[PDB]
Design a protein around this ligand. Sequence first.
Ligand SMILES: [Mg+2]
Ligand SMILES: [Zn+2]
Lengths: 66, 148, 347, 58, 148, 107, 58, 49, 343, 50
Amino acid sequence: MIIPVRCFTCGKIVGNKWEAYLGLLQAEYTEGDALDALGLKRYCCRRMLLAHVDLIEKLLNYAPLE
Amino acid sequence: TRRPEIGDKFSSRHGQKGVCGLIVPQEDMPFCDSGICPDIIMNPHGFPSRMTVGKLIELLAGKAGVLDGRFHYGTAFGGSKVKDVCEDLVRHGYNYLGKDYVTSGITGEPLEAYIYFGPVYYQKLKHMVLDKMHARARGPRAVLTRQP
Amino acid sequence: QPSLHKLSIMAHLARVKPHRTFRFNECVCTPYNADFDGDEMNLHLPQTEEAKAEALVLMGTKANLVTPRNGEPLIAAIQDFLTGAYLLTLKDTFFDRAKACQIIASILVGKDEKIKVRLPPPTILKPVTLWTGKQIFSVILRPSDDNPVRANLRTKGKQYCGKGEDLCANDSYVTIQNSELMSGSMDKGTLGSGSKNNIFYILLRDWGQNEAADAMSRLARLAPVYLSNRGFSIGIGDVTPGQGLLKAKYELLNAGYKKCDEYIEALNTGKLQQQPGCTAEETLEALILKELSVIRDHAGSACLRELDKSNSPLTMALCGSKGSFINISQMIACVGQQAISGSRVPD
Amino acid sequence: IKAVFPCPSEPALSKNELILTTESIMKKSEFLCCQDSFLQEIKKFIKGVSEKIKKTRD
Amino acid sequence: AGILFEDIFDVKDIDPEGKKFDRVSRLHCESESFKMDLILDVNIQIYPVDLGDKFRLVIASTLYEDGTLDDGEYNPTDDRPSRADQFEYVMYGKVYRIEGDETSTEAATRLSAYVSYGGLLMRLQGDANNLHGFEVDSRVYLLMKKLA
Amino acid sequence: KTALEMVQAAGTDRHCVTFVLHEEDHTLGNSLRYMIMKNPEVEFCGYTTTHPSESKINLRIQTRGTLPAVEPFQRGLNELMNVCQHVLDKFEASIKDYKDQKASRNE
Amino acid sequence: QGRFRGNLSGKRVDFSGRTVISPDPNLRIDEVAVPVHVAKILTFPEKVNKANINFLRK
Amino acid sequence: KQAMGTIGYNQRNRIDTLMYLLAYPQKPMVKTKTIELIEFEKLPAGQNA
Amino acid sequence: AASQAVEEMRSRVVLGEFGVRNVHTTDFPGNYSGYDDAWDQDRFEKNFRVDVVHMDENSLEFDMVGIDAAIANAFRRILLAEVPTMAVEKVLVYNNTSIVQDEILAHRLGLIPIHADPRLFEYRNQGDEEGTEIDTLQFRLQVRCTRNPHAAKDSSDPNELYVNHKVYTRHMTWIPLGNQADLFPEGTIRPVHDDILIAQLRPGQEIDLLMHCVKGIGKDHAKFSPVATASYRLLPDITLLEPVEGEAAEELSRCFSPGVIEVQEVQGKKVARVANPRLDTFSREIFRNEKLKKVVRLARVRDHYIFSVESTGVLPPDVLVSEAIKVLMGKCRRFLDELDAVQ
Amino acid sequence: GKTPAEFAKLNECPLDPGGYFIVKGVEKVILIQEQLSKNRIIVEADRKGA
Ligand SMILES: [Mg+2]
Ligand SMILES: [Zn+2]
C-alpha cells in the first residue's frame, strides 16, 4: 500500500527514501544510478524501492471527502 | 491482522508450495560478507526430484536485476538468458553463479559449501492455520440421528 | 485422511506445545504419506482406559516399525537425515575435539540427559588429533558405556562396484561391528525406509523396540546439527553442463538423427528388414525408440562423468535421499522420449 | 553371535565336534515345540558351516 | 616391546582408481624384508605421501615401551615419553576380520588382516608366520615414519 | 526464579554434570564453551538448545580426573569476563585515539 | 445420506480435532505436539482414585 | 488463484463476503510479458523475499 | 613440509573452487603435536588489538585481531538482539479516519526509531499500562488535512491543492511527564530520521493518536534492535604462488575487485602484486580463467575480523559496541552470582 | 467508454475485467460451455464391436 518503514531483510530505514526516489526519477536518472545516489548498498534495501508499487496514491482517489 | 506463524502456507511462483516450519531469530541466521541475513531458507531437496530449474534461474536473474535496477524478463520460450545475467553479476562483485561465501550465525565459523542467495517472489496463500485449526469435545448434535 | 494401509492411523504419546500446529517427528512421514504442504491430520482422543491401553499396545509407533505387507521398515530416516548421515560418514570428514564434542552433545536432551557421553578415542593421534566422522555416527548406536546395544550388519551399499568385498574404491560396503561403523557410508539402503539391512531394522530384531526408537530419535537430533553447520546448497552452477557434455551431445544427436533418417528412407523408398511378429511400421517405431534410448542413455553417461564430487544433485542421488540419476541426466543432458501410454505421441 | 560373544578362552571346534555338539543341543526338551522343517534347515546350515571349516583347515 | 609387526615398506602406487577423495588416498605398498603387501588409507592433508617414498611401519598393541597394557582412555593432554615420539604419524583402530585367501586351492599360507582406523581401512596381507598376535577385536596403534 | 540448575549424571560423582542455563541461547553458550574447552582438564564440553520454543541450553561438562565440573565452569565464566573487560578497555582506547587523531587533522 | 451408508457404516465422532501439520524433529518418534488451544478443549475423563487424588485437586 | 493480493483500486469501498489483502505488496522482480499485458504489476500479489 | 600444512590448517581458511576448507576453529589444548594451546591470559593480552579504520555518523568499521569466532559472534549477536533501545508499543488512537488501517498504522509507528538514550530508562513491569516518569516516554500525533484556500484553476498536483496531505514524522510532538522537561533538554527527545512517511491523507481525514515508547531488547521484537545490520568478515590475504607477468597480469587485475591488484612497471614490464587485500569481496572469478587457477591461494585470515556496525541513529555506534560488551560482561556476572548463591 | 478519472465517481476499478453479472448482490459469471458440434456425421464404435 504505502512504502514500508524498514527494509524486510536487514533493517535499514527505507521509508524516508521514497520521496527522494521519485524526485530523482523526475530528473531522469536511471534506477541503477538513483538507488546508488540514495545510498542503498545491499540489494535487500534496493528491492524495497525497485519493486514497490504505490497503491495509496491511487487508493486515495476513491476515499470519501468533503 | 494475521501475521505469519507456524502453519501458514507460502508458495514460490513455481509450485514449490510449503508450510512454514520454524521461525528463528535474526541472530541465528546465516549471513554474507555484506551482512545480508536471509528471510526464507528453502530446502535444497525440493529441486532434484521436481527439476524446477526455473526457480534457480529466477533467483539468479532477480539477484542480477536488483543490483542494477532492471527487471529481467522470464518470458516463456525466450527471456533473458543465463549468459547475460552472469556477466551482470560479475560486474558488481558477486559470484557469477549466485553462490556466496556464507558465515553461520550459530557457531560463527564459516560454512564449507557456498550458499545460493537471491530474491525470489514468494506469495502468501490463503490457507492459514488459524482458520483450519478445529476441535470438538462435545457440543451440538443432530435432532434426528443423535450424533455430532 | 485417505487411509490406505493400517499405518495411516497410529497412536502417539501427546505433549503440549505453544504454537498452533500438530508437530510430529519427520521419521513418521513415511507411514502417513504426509508431506507438510498444508496437509491436515485428524486427532482422536480415546475416552476409556481400555481404549487407551489397546491404542498404546497395539497401535503405538514403537510397536509398528515394520509394515505388514512384506516386513520392511517404514519408520526410518528421510531426506536431510540421509544426506546428513551420508555427508557425516564419508571418508573425507575429520573433526577436531571441539567440533566433535559439539556434534555429540546434541543428543544430550530428553531421556538421554542423564547418561555419560563416552567420547570415543581419536583416530589420528600424532600430527593432529582427528575423530573420523564414522565414530561420531557410531555414537548414535551406543552413546554410553552401559548401553547393552551391540549392533551388527554387513551389506552392500548402493554404489558398490561388485568386486570390492570391503575394499572398494568407493568405500561403499557397510560394515558395522559391535555398534562401531568400520567402513562404508550410510546410503538410503542402510538407514532409509526402503528395505531390510536397515540398521534400525537390525536394532529392532535383535535388541527390541526401545533401542530402535532411541536410535531414530538420536539420528534425527544429530544429523541436522551437523548439516546446518556444514552448509549444503544447490545452485544454477550445479546443473550447468560443461564442455565435455556439449561436445558429446552434439555428436550423439548427429549420429542418432542420421541413423533415424536412414531407417525412414529404408521404410518409405526401399526394403526395410521387418522384425518378427509385427508390421513394418512397428519395426520402424521399435528401431527409432531404440536409437533415441541410446541417445538419452549415452548423454546421461556423459553428463554424470564430468560432474565434480560435492555436486549437490549428485550427492542427493548417491545417498538416495531425493532424486536419482535419471533426473540429473534429464536436467543437464537431454530430456528423453516423451512417451504417452507407452508409445510415441499419437497424431 | 560370533561378533557379540567372542570367547577368546575357548577352543575352536572341528567338523565332527561341531556336528556332535550341535546334535547334543538339538535333542533337548525345548526344541520339540518347533516344526520339523525348521530343525532340518538348522541342521542343513550347520552342515554347511562344518564343510566350510573342513575346507579351510584342509 | 609390545610390537605386533615392524617392517620397512615402499610405495608402489598412490591412487589406483582415481582421486576419489580430497583428503584420503589409497596407498598400495610392498615390503622389503618380507613379502608383505599393504593397502592403506592415510590422511594426505596432514601428512603428504609421494610416489616413490619409503616409510617404516609399526603396528603395536600399546604406546608405552615398558609394556603397560592398561588403556582405559587415551589422554592427549598428558605428557610422558611414549612410543609415538619416534614417529610422525600415529593412528588407532581395531582389527575386525582375519580372513584366509581363496586364490590358491591347497597348501597356501597367505592371510589377510583387515584393520579399520575409524573408517580408514588397511589390508595387511602376507605369510601367516609374520602376523602372530593379531586377533579379532584387538586395538592396535599404527605408527609410521618416512625415511630419507 | 533460579536460572542455574545442576543435573548430575546417573552413576558419576560430580565430575560429569549438566548445567541447565535458563534465559540464555547460543550467544552465551558458544562463548562459554570456547572458554571452557581451553581448560585442559575438560574432556568433553558442549551445549544444546533443548527446544527452540524454550530459552534453555544444556551445557554438559565432563572432566578427566577427580575435580568436580563446577570449577571448570567457574573458571570459564571468570576467563570470559576478563576477556570482555580487556576488549572493552582496548576498544574504548582505540575509539578515543581515533577521534583525537581525526580532530587533530585538517585544523 | 440414508441410515445405512450415512449413519451405520461410518459415523461422526467427537473428542477429535483437525489441524495443519508442520515438522518437528526434536520430539521422539512416538510423540506428537498438540497445541494448547486444542488441548484445552479435548478432555479425558479421569476417575478419581487413591493414586491421583492430589493431582486432580490441583 | 489463491495468492493474497489486492483486488483492485476500489478495495476499501468494497464490502464482500471474504476479502484477503496483503499489507505491503510488491511487484515481481523477474516478470513475464504476460504480466505487462494483463497489468499484474499495477496491483500485485506477493513479496520479494 | 608437514609443518607448513599444519600451520596453514590452523590459521588460514582457504577458499576452493568448489567448497571452503579448514573452517573450524581448532587451536585448543591437546589438538596438535608439539603446540601448547592452553588458555594463557598474557598471550591474549599481548596479541589482541583493535584498529578503527573508518567512522562517521551512523556507521563504524573496525578491525579486531586475536579474538576468536565464538566471541566475535557473541558481540554481533549482542548487537542484534540484546542492546536495548526505545520503541513505540502502545498506540492509543482517537479518531483515525484515514485509509491506512489502525493496525497497520500502529505497526508503522512501532518501527520508527526514537532518539532517546535508553540507559536512562527502566523496563516497564508486568502490566502497568499507565507508566511513570522513569519507564516511558510519550508522543502525541495530531494531523488534520484541509484544502489549500488559494489554488490555480488546473488543480493537478497534490502538493499545491492540499496542506498536510502527507503525515511525516516531523509531526510527532513530544509530551513530557513529570521532570522529563528538566532532565532532557529541548530538542533531544525526537524521532530520528525526521522525514519518514507515516501515512498519507486527503481533506476531511484526521489522525490523532498517542504513543507510548518503552524500553525493550531486540530478542523480543525487531523494532528494538539498534543496528541496521552488524556483521563481520575475516580479512583476506590473496597470495601469489608463481609470478604473474606479461598479459596475464592484466586479466588477473580484472578477476578481482577494482582496488586490490595493482600493476606496476619495473623494466618496461608489468608485474602484478597484491596491494590492498581488504577491499576484496571474493567473487572468486579467478577460477573461470583456466591458466590462473594455479597461481593464487585465496584465503581468509582466521583471527582478523572486520566488524561493520551501521546504527539506526538511536545512539552513535561506538557507544553501541561499548554496550554490547557490557551486556556480555553482565551475563557472565549473573551466572557467577548464581554459583555463589548456590555454594 | 469512461476515463480513469470517472471510474472514481462510480467506485469501480479500472482494471476490473467485467463480463460478470450482478444478481441479488453476488457477482455471477456464465461459464463458457463446451459442446459437440451439431449437425455433423459422427462415425463411432458400438459397445459390442459394431
Ligand atoms: Mg500433500
Ligand atoms: Zn535492506
